[PDB]
Amino acid sequence: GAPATVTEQGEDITSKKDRGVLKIVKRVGNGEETPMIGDKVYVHYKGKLSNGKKFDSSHDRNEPFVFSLGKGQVIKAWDIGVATMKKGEIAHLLIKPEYAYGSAGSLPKIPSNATLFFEIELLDFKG
Numbered sequence: 001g002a003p004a005t006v007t008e009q010g011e012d013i014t015s016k017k018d019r020g021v022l023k024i025v026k027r028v029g030n031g032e033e034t035p036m037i038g039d040k041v042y043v044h045y046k047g048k049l050s051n052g053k054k055f056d057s058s059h060d061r062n063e064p065f066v067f068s069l070g071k072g073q074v075i076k077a078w079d080i081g082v083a084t085m086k087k088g089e090i091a092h093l094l095i096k097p098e099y100a101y102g103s104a105g106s107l108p109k110i111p112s113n114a115t116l117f118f119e120i121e122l123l124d125f126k127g
């Protein structure tokens with residue numbers, strides 16, 4: 001399925017080139033501009049664990065997740081990943097635990113050492 005495909009066919013977007021965050025662009029967004037550090041970014045997403053379970057979705061809440069890019073308000077992979085996206089883009093991310101919740105996990109939903117899959121849509125970004 002889509003998690004296997006991004007695992008096997010995604011591009012490494014990490015600065016370290018350690019394959020900790022892999023990406024596939026599913027829908028190309030608008031123009032060339034990506035958000036900048038400190039922008040307010042509006043996204044929709046769905047996340048899955050490696051047991052095949054959906055663990056979260058903003059779509060199901062009927063409103064986007066909003067955060068300030070590049071400030072450590074989210075897992076490292078999200079700061080890195082959303083920074084690569086154009087407005088209107090849909091992407092898949094496959095994230096090793098070192099760029100997510102690590103050995104600690106995040107109870108109750110995220111186990112220790114969890115690889116995460118997301119589908120993410122960048123709705124908008126604003127300074």
Ligand SMILES: C=C[C@@H]1[C@H]2CCC[C@@H](C(=O)N3[C@H](C(N)=O)CC[C@@H]13)N2S(=O)(=O)c1cc(Cl)cc(Cl)c1
Binds near residue numbers: 047055056072
């Ligand atoms: C609104 C939730 C967000 C989501 C969406 C952004 C990615 C990631 C995340 O960085 N988060 C922040 C964090 N600093 O940890 C705050 C809470 C949590 N998650 S997540 O999808 O990985 C996630 C979902 C759920 Cl239901 C629980 C957790 Cl611990 C994480």
